[PDB]
Structure 1
Amino acid sequence: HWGYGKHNGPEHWHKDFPIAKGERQSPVDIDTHTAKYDPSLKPLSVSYDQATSLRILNNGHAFNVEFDDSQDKAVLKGGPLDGTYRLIQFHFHWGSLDGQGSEHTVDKKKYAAELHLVHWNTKYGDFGKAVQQPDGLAVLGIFLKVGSAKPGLQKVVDVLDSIKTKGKSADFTNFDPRGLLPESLDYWTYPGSLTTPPLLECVTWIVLKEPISVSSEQVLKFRKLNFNGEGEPEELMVDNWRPAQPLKNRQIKASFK
């Protein structure tokens, strides 16, 4: 199965998932001088006050904090989006070193990690149906740089010991994702895809310009997780990011002048 090692990493994915070489793959490099300000972009609306987190799971390629999306609680709307998108989960991609780890890059700059808050278009009824649509998901991407600790991230860091290996999960209720957002909601947006197999081209990417800062100790704990299952040879969960893909026939739009 696919992963991030030399023998099953990003360069191999196209054999089982031909869409890997598709027309709207993610991530991409964001060339800040080429992205054009779009005055028509409506303001972004992130309404997470009623978010209901439930569990945290190590799925063998990252850890997902899952939410109750059986009702319209936490939603994302506005910006380039038509309609309402419901939060279902968030996860991160990070490196073995502070100098790499993000999937999107800014003028080729790689951040230490990148957070993906995943939302699905409620007009499609459920997540599985949504990923089959070009406007099925809206993912909010937030860069992480190493510096001061992010208070709102500590509850996540402290539970990682309990989900060290693939397939382990733990109760994770009452977590407030608002604590993972930067001050400004200025963003870049473009049509793209999931960055892991099946690599479906169903995502409207909304990548925030302002990164959040996390401490070296916080990201060091991410790097202690395992890709393997319990009782298997230890493979540290690091560098679970896909590199920038061809922009092709797409334009990245900026929400700010």
Structure 2
Amino acid sequence: SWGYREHNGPIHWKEFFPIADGDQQSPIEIKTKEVKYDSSLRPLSIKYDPSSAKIISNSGHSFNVDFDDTENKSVLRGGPLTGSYRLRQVHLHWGSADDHGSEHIVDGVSYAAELHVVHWNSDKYPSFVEAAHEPDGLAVLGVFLQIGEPNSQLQKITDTLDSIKEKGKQTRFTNFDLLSLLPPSWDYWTYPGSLTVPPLLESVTWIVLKQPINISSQQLAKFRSLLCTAEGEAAAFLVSNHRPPQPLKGRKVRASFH
């Protein structure tokens, strides 16, 4: 089964998931001088209720903060999107080294980590699972993290990691102010792409914010202490969980700014 280790890692996913070689795969290299400013794009409009977060868990591939998506208390609107997309989950990608941890790469710069905020089109589809199978079903906001001052807005997360060390562990996680984790500028790039983990579905409108947020090296090192293995299996650590960049295949990357 899939992961980021030598025998089950990204380079081997195309052996098992046909879509891994598809024409709309993510993540990509963003070349900032080659991106097209598009005046038809709209500003992002975000409303994230701190009561929406409920549980944090170790999936074996990252931590996952799950939100109550029963109704439209937390939504993303605007940007390239038609209608309202409902907040479902947040997770993080990193590498074994602080200078090569992100999924998207900007003018050759890989950041220390990348946060993904996953949302689904509830205006058109009745659930996350159904939306995940349609070209306009999902929207993922990407936020880069760069090494710097410790981020006090990550402290709630790092405090829980000891209780979710093994794959499948979960703990209560509520009153989380996700809005305060985002950077002050909501300028972004966008393109059509895919999930960056199996099943690699081509259902994602990517919105990658230009402005990175900070994290300390100590904070980021704590994530690598999560395991990719369950209780009572031989332990292996989740030291890296990012997919390499995929061919653009004629897709247009657009910028909200110039």
TM-score of the two chains, using structure 1 as the length reference: 0.98
**RMSD, aligned α-carbons:** 0.9
Instruction: State the AA in 2 paired with 1:140.
Output: L
Structure 1 alignment gaps of length 5 or more:
none
Structure 2 alignment gaps of length 5 or more:
none
Instruction: State the AA in 2 paired with 1:254.
Output: A
Give the equivalent residue in structure 2 for 1:100. Answer: 100
Instruction: State the AA in 2 paired with 1:91.
Output: H
Instruction: State the AA in 2 paired with 1:69.
Output: D
1:82-123 deviation digits (Å, cap 9, x = unpaired): 011000000000111101111110012111110000000002
SS of equivalent to 2:129:
helix
CA contact (8 A) 1:51 1:74 kept: no
Give the equivalent residue in structure 1 for 2:39. Answer: 39
Structure 1 residue ranges, 4+ long, deviating more than 3 angstroms after superposition: none
Give the equivalent residue in structure 2 for 1:119. Answer: 119
1:115-169 deviation digits (Å, cap 9, x = unpaired): 0000000020100100110010000000011101111111001100000010100
What is the deviation of 1:27? 0.3
Moved more, 189-198 or 232-241: 232-241
Give the equivalent residue in structure 2 for 1:233. Answer: 234
CA contact (8 A) 1:93 1:103 kept: yes
CA contact (8 A) 1:50 1:73 kept: no
CA distance in 1 between partners of 2:156 and 2:199 (Å)? 30
CA contact (8 A) 2:101 2:111 kept: yes
What is the deviation of 1:50? 5.5
1:17-40 deviation digits (Å, cap 9, x = unpaired): 110000100000001110111111
Moved more, 58-67 or 214-223: 214-223
Give the equivalent residue in structure 2 for 1:160. Answer: 161
CA distance in 2 between partners of 1:65 and 1:37 (Å)? 33
CA distance in 2 between partners of 1:28 and 1:51 (Å)? 33
Distance 1:162 1:125, change over 3 A: same
SS of equivalent to 1:124:
coil
TM-score of the two chains, using structure 2 as the length reference: 0.98
What is the deviation of 1:207? 0.2
Give the equivalent residue in structure 1 for 2:69. Answer: 69
What is the deviation of 1:233? 2.0
CA distance in 1 between partners of 2:4 and 2:50 (Å)? 35
SS of equivalent to 2:133:
coil
CA distance in 2 between partners of 1:118 and 1:25 (Å)? 16
Spell out the pairing of 1:80-95 with structure 2 (5 A cutoff).
80-95=80-95
Spell out the pairing of 1:16-27 with structure 2 (5 A cutoff).
16-27=16-27
Instruction: State the AA in 1 paired with 2:69.
Output: D
CA distance in 2 between partners of 1:42 and 1:60 (Å)? 36
SS of equivalent to 1:82:
coil
What is the deviation of 1:14? 1.2
CA contact (8 A) 1:153 1:179 kept: no
Distance 1:153 1:67, change over 3 A: same
SS of equivalent to 2:11:
coil
Give the equivalent residue in structure 2 for 1:193. Answer: 194
SS of equivalent to 2:218:
helix
Task: Report percent identity of matched pairs.
Answer: 60
Give the equivalent residue in structure 2 for 1:139. Answer: 140
Give the equivalent residue in structure 1 for 2:173. Answer: 172
SS of equivalent to 1:11:
helix
CA distance in 2 between partners of 1:220 and 1:239 (Å)? 11
Give the equivalent residue in structure 2 for 1:48. Answer: 48
Paired residues, what number? 257
Instruction: State the AA in 2 paired with 1:100.
Output: H
What is the deviation of 1:49? 3.4
CA distance in 2 between partners of 1:109 and 1:136 (Å)? 29
What is the deviation of 1:232? 2.0
